[PDB]
Amino acid sequence: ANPLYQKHIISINDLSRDDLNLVLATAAKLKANPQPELLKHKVIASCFFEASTRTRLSFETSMHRLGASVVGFSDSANTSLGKKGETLADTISVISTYVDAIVMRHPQEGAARLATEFSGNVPVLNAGDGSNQHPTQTLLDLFTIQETQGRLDNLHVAMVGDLKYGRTVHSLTQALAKFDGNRFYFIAPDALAMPQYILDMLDEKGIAWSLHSSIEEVMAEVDILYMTRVQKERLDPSEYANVKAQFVLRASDLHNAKANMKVLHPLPRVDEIATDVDKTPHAWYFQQAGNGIFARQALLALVLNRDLVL
Amino acid sequence: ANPLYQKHIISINDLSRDDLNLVLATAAKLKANPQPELLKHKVIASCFFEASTRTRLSFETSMHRLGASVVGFSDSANTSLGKKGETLADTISVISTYVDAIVMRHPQEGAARLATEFSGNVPVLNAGDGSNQHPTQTLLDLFTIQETQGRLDNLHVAMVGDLKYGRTVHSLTQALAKFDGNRFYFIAPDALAMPQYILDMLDEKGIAWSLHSSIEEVMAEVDILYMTRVQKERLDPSEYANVKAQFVLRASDLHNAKANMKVLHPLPRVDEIATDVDKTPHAWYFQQAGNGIFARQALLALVLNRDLVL
Amino acid sequence: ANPLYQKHIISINDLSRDDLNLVLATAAKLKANPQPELLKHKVIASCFFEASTRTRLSFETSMHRLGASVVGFSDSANTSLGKKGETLADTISVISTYVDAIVMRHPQEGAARLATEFSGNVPVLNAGDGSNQHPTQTLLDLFTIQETQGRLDNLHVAMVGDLKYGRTVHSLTQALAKFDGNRFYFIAPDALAMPQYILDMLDEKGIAWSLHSSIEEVMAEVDILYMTRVQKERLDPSEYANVKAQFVLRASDLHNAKANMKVLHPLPRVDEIATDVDKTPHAWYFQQAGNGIFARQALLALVLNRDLVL
Amino acid sequence: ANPLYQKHIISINDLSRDDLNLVLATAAKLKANPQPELLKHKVIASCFFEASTRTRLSFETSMHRLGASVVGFSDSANTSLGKKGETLADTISVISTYVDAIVMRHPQEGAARLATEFSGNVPVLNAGDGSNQHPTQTLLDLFTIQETQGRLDNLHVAMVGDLKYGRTVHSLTQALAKFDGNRFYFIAPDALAMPQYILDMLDEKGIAWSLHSSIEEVMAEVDILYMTRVQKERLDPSEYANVKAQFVLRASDLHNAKANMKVLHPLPRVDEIATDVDKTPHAWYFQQAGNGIFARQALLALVLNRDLVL
C-alpha cells in the first residue's frame, strides 16, 4: 500500500517532500504509459458546490481517463442542496454512502477538512475551498516546472502580479521551499506584495528572495516566470490600470530571457499576458493546464489503488 | 423473464406484495454480491425536470454501479426544454428514441404515467411527480426496515411530524399495510394529522393504529421511528415553532427505547433530529439513504435484465 | 389637541372604542367636505419595505388629497436599504429626521412598533407588518359597514374563507367585538377555521357566534358578507379546489339576501367572488376599497393636525 | 443674483471658500426660518441611475421642503433607460427640456460633468458619480462640524477606517484644508491608509497631520471623530476581522473625550460604531444625516433662486 492510499488530500502543507515526489513520479509514468482501467469499477463524486468549469473538466477528465465513473454537480442554484437549512456535514454523510471518493470545491475555507470528518473511509480531495489550499493546482504547477526544468531545486523563480491575494502563489512558494537552493524574485505593486508571513518562512530556511518593481530587472536570470491573475476588484479601476504597468507580459520583454525559461499562469488569463507571447517558446500556460490531467490522475491513482507500479 | 422485466414503475400502489418482495430480495443480493457489468451496454436517461440532487446522485450512482451509461439533465432553467410550448409528451417521444430507460422527476402529478404513453417499450421509472408516488423512496425505506428489523410484519411503527403533507409516509403506510400484524403510532399536530383516507384503509384491513401527542408515550414499544420533514410553509412561523414542541427528536428521548429500534428520516433533516442523536445506535437515516443505492439498483436490474440470479 | 394627535398607530387593539368612533367620525366629515390644504407644508414618508401597490396608492393618494408632500419607496431591489447589516432602527433614526410622519409596511411582525422607539416625536403609521395589525385596513372596513349599515352594533356578520390565516378578519372581529349585540357566522373549511383564541374572546364577552359549512345556511339573515382571500399555498392544489366548493360566491347565492346586505372583500379577489356578482346591489368591495382614502385621510389629519373641526 | 445662481455643482474642489461659506450660511438660515414656497412652481428631476435610498430621500425631501415639484427614478431594472446604446448625453438632452434642475447620481465617474454639456442653462447637481465628488455630502459634514464646533478652523480632526477608498474623507479633508490651523489625525490599517496625494496637499499648505494605530492615542484632544465605512470587499474576510481591531468605536473608548467632541459617520454604519455609543452626547451621526436637508435645501435655493435673503 502506497503512503497516500486512502488518505485525504486537503492542504498542500500536509504533504511531505516524499509525498510530493511520489505524486510527481506517478504523474510522469501515467503520462508515459496510460492506464485506462486502473479505476474501472470505481464511482467518484465531483461535487462543485462552487462552479469552476476548467478545474471541473480537468478533474473529471482525469477520472474517465482511469476508467472511473463520475456523478456530481456544479451547484450554483442549479441543484437543491443550496437549501440553507441542511448542513455540509449531512450532505457529505449521505454522498459518502454512495461513492468511493469525493472531489469537492466549495466557497468556504475548511469545507474539505470538515467533509473528512463526515465521510468515512471515503477519501476527500480538495478541489479548493475558497481562499485556502488548492492542492492539485500546486501539484500541476510543480509537475510542470519539474518537467520543463528537469528539477525543482536550485531554480530562479519569479512570480508577478497580485501576490497578496494569490493563493496559487502562496501555495507554490511554500512547496518549492521544501526543495533546496531556490531563488525567488517577487514582482508586484506595494498594495499587493507577498505577505510578510511568507517572507518570514523563507527567512527561517535561509532561502534567497528579493523584491523588484518590474520583470525587466530579473528576466535575464529567471528559469520560471509565474504570472498571476490580477482581479480589478482588489483595487480601484483607476488604481488597477495605473499600476497595471509592466505587470503585464508582452513578447518584447522576452528578448534576453534564458532559452529554458518557461512562462506559467493559473489559466484565467487576460490583461496579464499579451497574445503575442503565445507563439514564443517560453509560453507554457496551456501546457501547464494540460498537466493538470496527469497530476490529478496520479492523485486519484495513489488514493484509490493500493499498489500502482510504472 | 422476471415479473418486473420491461415494466413501468410509476406508483407504489401498482406493486403487489410479490413485487415488493422481489425488489427487496434483489437488493440484498446486489448488496452482498455487486454486479458491475449487469447493464454494461445500456444507456439510461436521468431526466430531472425538477431538481433533486440527493435523489439524482442516488439513482445515477445506482446506474453506474451496474455498468450502465447515463445522459440527462437537472432542468431548472438550466436547459432549453422549459420552452413552455413543447409538451412533455413530445419530449418523451424524442428521448425514448435515444435511450433504453427513463428515470424522471417532475413538479407535476402524473408526469411519469403520461410519459409511459409516449415512450414505447422503453420503461419509465418515476423518481417522483410532485406530490404523488415516490416509488424508489418507499422501497428503500421498506428495504431498510426489513434489514434492521429482519422482517416487515408484526412491527410497531411510529411516524412523527407532518403526516398530512408527507407523501413518503402515506406511501410507506400503505406499503406496510400489505404485510400482517403491524402496529402504527401516529404522532403529529392536529393541523397536520394523518389523512382520514389512510385511517379508513387501515380500518378496512383491521390494522391497529392510535394517535399520540408526543413520542414519549410510545418510545418504549416502537421498533421503527420514522421522522418526517416539517416545512415551515405549511404553517405560520409562530405556529411552527410553537407546535414544533417535542415533534423534534433529541438523544434524551431515547433513554428507554428498544435495543433494535431504528430512527429513519427522508433525508432533508434539520429542526427535526438533533445532532446528538447521530452518535446513538438508533440513528439510521444516513444508512437509510445509503440503501437507496441497492433498492434503485435492484429496480433497474429487474426492469432492464430479463433473468437476474443471485 | 385631539386624542390621537402625535400618536403612533401600530395595532388596532391599541385603540379604544372612542378612538374608533373618533376616526370614523372624521372620515365621514372629510368625505363630505374635502380639505385639500389641511397638511399643506407637511412631508410624509411612504416606506414600503415590502411592496403593496394597492395599499401604497391608497395611502399616498390620501396624503395628496390633504395637500401633504410625499417621499418614499417600495423596497424590493428598488432601493439600497436592503443591504444587510444596517438595522431597521438606524434606517428609522435617519428618515425620522427628514419627515413629519412615517407610514410603513414591513414583511416582519413588530416592525412599526420598533420604529416608534427610534422615530422621535415623529409618528409612525403601521401600514402593516406582515401578518400582524393592519390598522387602516380594519378602520376602512368598519367605516364601510357603518356607512352601509348605519351602525356597528346589533349586526349579523358572516366571514367566509381562510379565517385561520386571514389577519384582516381577526382584526375586524376584535374591532366589532368592541360594539354591542353583534352576531357572527363563521364559514370555513376545518383546516382554516377561526382560531380558538378569537372564539374564547367572544365567549368572554358573551357574544353570539356559530360555525356553518356554507353561506346558504345564513344568507337570509346576514347584514355583512365578509369574503376572505384563500391563497392556494395554505393548502395542496387538490385540497384547495376540492374544498373551494361553495366557499366562493356567485350571483345565484344572493337570491334571498336582505336588501341591505353588503358583500365585502379585502381587495385581492379571484377564485372567491364571481364577476356576475359585480352587477348586483350587494357588491361593495370596490366601494370598500374606495373608503380606504377617507379612513386613511382621517388618521393622518388627527395625527398631524391638533384640532380638526367638521 | 447670488454667486451660485444657475451654477452647476459637480465637484467640491470647484467651490471657493466663499462658496462654502455662502452655502453654509444659507443652510443655517433655512434651518432657523423655513421657506416652504421658495421653489413653488419649479419641477426638479431626481435621476438616480444608481440607487441610493438614503441620499435620494434626503435630496427629494429637501425639494419638497422648499415647495418644488419632483419627478425622477432610481434606475436598476426600475426603468427603460438602461437599454444600451442610448447615451447619457441624449438622456440629459431630453430630460433637460422637461425640468428646471437635475439632481443625479451615476455609477460612473464624470457623469454629472458630462451632463452639464448637454443640459442647457438647466443646472445639474451631482449627487454622486461613483467614487468621485459627492458635493452635498461634504457640505453637510462641514455644516455639522461648524454647527457643533462653532467654526471650521483650528480644530482637531480624526478620521478612522478606510481612508484609502473612503471618498467622503478625501473630500472632507480637502474642504477643511481651505480653512486655517486645522490639525489632522489619520487612524487606519496600512493597507487602507490615506493616499499620499492628500498628504502632499497638506504639506503644501503646511497643515499639521499625523498617523496613529488606534483612536486611544488621540481621543483626548480630538474635536471631531470622523468614522468611516469599512467594506469587507476591500479586503479578505480574515484580513478584515483581524485588523478590524480598535478601528471600531465603543462607548468605553469615550471616557476621556473632550466635552465638545462629536462623532460623525457617513451613514451606512455597522461593524464600526457599537450601539452603546448612540446614547452618549458625542454621537452625532443621525444629527449629521439630519443636516443633509438644510445643506441640500441651501444648494437648491442658491441655484434656482436669484436673490435669497435671511
Place this chain on the structure above:
Amino acid sequence: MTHDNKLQVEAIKRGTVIDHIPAQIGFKLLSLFKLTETDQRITIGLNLPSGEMGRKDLIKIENTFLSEDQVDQLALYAPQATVNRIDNYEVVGKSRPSLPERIDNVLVCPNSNCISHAEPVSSSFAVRKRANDIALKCKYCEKEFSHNVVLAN
C-alpha cells in the same frame, strides 16, 4: 445580635441572599441576570441541601440589594426561591418571587420572523397565568406562546 459563625454556609455581613434554588437554576440566574458583573463580593454555592429534598443552589451578593420587580423576575426560574435581605449583619428583610406582568431582556421570541431578532432592542413579554401553563406575549410581533416553548431555545 452577635459574632459566631459557620462553614457549611458562608454568612458574611451586608448583602442580598438568594436561598432555595432548583438544581441547574443558579448558574442560569447568574448568566441571565448578569449578577457577576460587579466588583462587590459574591459567594455562590451549588448542589447544597436545604429545608426541602432535592439538591439546590445558593447565591449571595455582598453590598447590593434587589428591588421588588427584580425579585419577581425570578418566579419563572426559581418559583420556590427565598430572597432574604441582609444588613446589621442580620436579616433586615425577606420576600418570595411573585409572577410579574412583564419580563424583559432575557427571553427570546420563538417567532423567527419577529423583528426583535436582528435589531438593537430589548425583548419584552406580557405574562398571564393559567392551567398548567404561563402565556407570554411578545411586545413586538404580538404573538403569544407557552413559557415551555419560549424557554426551549
Place this chain on the structure above:
Amino acid sequence: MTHDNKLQVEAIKRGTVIDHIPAQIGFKLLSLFKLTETDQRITIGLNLPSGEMGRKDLIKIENTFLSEDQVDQLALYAPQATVNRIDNYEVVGKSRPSLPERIDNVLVCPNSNCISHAEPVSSSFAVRKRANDIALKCKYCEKEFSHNVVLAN
C-alpha cells in the same frame, strides 16, 4: 491531619480547587468550561482577596479532578491561576496552567467565511507563543490570528 474549620474560605473535603483567578475570569471559566453541569457540589467565590494585590475569583468542585490538558486549557484565561488538588481532606496535588498546543470547543473563529460556523463541529486552534502575542491557527480555514482578535467576539 486534623479537623479545624475556618470561614472566610470554604475548605470542604475531596475536590479540585482553582485558586487565584483574575477579576471577571471566574464566571467565564464556569460558562466556557461547563463546570456547573454536574451533580457534584460546587463552591464559588468572586471578588475574594488573596495574597497578591487586588481582587480575584475562586472555584471549588467537590469530588471531581481535572487532567493535565484541562488545567492548561486555562492558561489563556487564568495564566497566574493555581490548581491545588484535594483528597484526604488535604492537598494531594498541585499544578499551574501551561499554554497548550491546541484549544478546542471554546474559541470562535474570527473568519466569517470559515466552515465551522454553521456546521456541527467543534472549534479548534493551534497555539504558538510570541512577542506580546499568542497566535491561534484555525483547524478548518487554516487562517491565523492573535488571541486578542479571537477573544474579541
